[model samples]
Target: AFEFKLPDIGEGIHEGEIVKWFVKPGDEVNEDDVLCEVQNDKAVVEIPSPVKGKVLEILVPEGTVATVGQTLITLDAPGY
Candidate 1:
């Protein structure tokens, strides 16, 4: 399984609150696809997928906070 983690969105961001999820378990995604939206202390940002795969799980849901480098989604994909 491949896991997608919350990455630093720059501007010294360390955390974010999930605003919306465009995918769910069982959804297939392509690299660079928008996965969700998050609200940081300064702005609302869209999060994108780094790999193409079938989503296996969503570790965080809307209305929840996520920390940088924390796993947010799992995937079933090539070589994983």
Candidate 2:
């Protein structure tokens, strides 16, 4: 089992609002691909996939506050 963590959403980007999701649970994603969009106090940022695998779960919902180190998504490695 592999997990992807939420990056810093505060400080210069301390707070953010979840905008939308590009992919969902059970979806396949490749590294560096867009995962979700979050609007920080300053601007909107596109979160990217750090691993190529099948998403297992989406731990955060749109419009929710995403905290750093939070499990944004769980991944099951390909062929496993």
Candidate 3:
């Protein structure tokens, strides 16, 4: 299983809120695919996937406030 976690959203960005997702659970994604949207103090940003696989779950929901390094999604890489 692959885990998608929130990255450090710039300096001084203490917390982030979930905005939306470009792909839903069970969706297949490739490298550079926009996975979800996360909102910080400034603007909403899209989180993209770096690997190709099937998304297993969306750990965070819209409007959820979370800190950096939090796991937000899980994936399944069948051959890996």
Candidate 4:
């Protein structure tokens, strides 16, 4: 299992609120695919997947705030 964490989107940005999710559990995704939209203090940003795999779980739901390095989703990505 691979844990997809919320990465730093901007300078001094430590957290973000999830605005929308483009994927769900069991969905297959490719690298650089847009996974979700997040709103921070400065702007709304799109989050992208870093690996290709099947989404196993969504740890942060929409409208929830998550800090940087917090696992936002999980995936079944072997050898990653």
Give each model's whole-structure lDDT: 0.74, 0.70, 0.70, 0.76
Model 2: per-residue Cα lDDT over 1-80, one tens digit each: 66544455446655446788788677778877777788866778876765678877887867687666676667777665
Residue 44 lDDT, candidate 2, scale 0-100: 81
Off by over 4 Å in 2: 1-16, 76-80
Candidate 1: residue 52 lDDT (0-100) = 87
TM-score of every candidate relative to the true structure: 0.68, 0.65, 0.64, 0.70
**Superior candidate under TM-score, 2 versus 3:** 2
| Local accuracy of candidate 3 as per-residue lDDT tens digits, 1-80 | 77654456557865557777677777778877876677766787875665788887776756677666776777787777
lDDT per residue for candidate 4 within 1-80, as digits (tens), equals 77645456556767667888888777888987887788767888886776889887887777888776777777787887
Candidate whose lDDT is highest: 4
Query: Best candidate, TM-score-wise?
Result: 4
Can you tell me which runs of candidate 3 are displaced by over 4 Å?
A: 6-11, 68-70, 78-80
Deviation (Å) of 10 in candidate 3? 12
The RMSD (Cα, Å) of candidate 1 is: 3.4
* Model 2 steric clash total: 5
User: Backbone collision count in every prediction?
Assistant: 0, 5, 0, 0
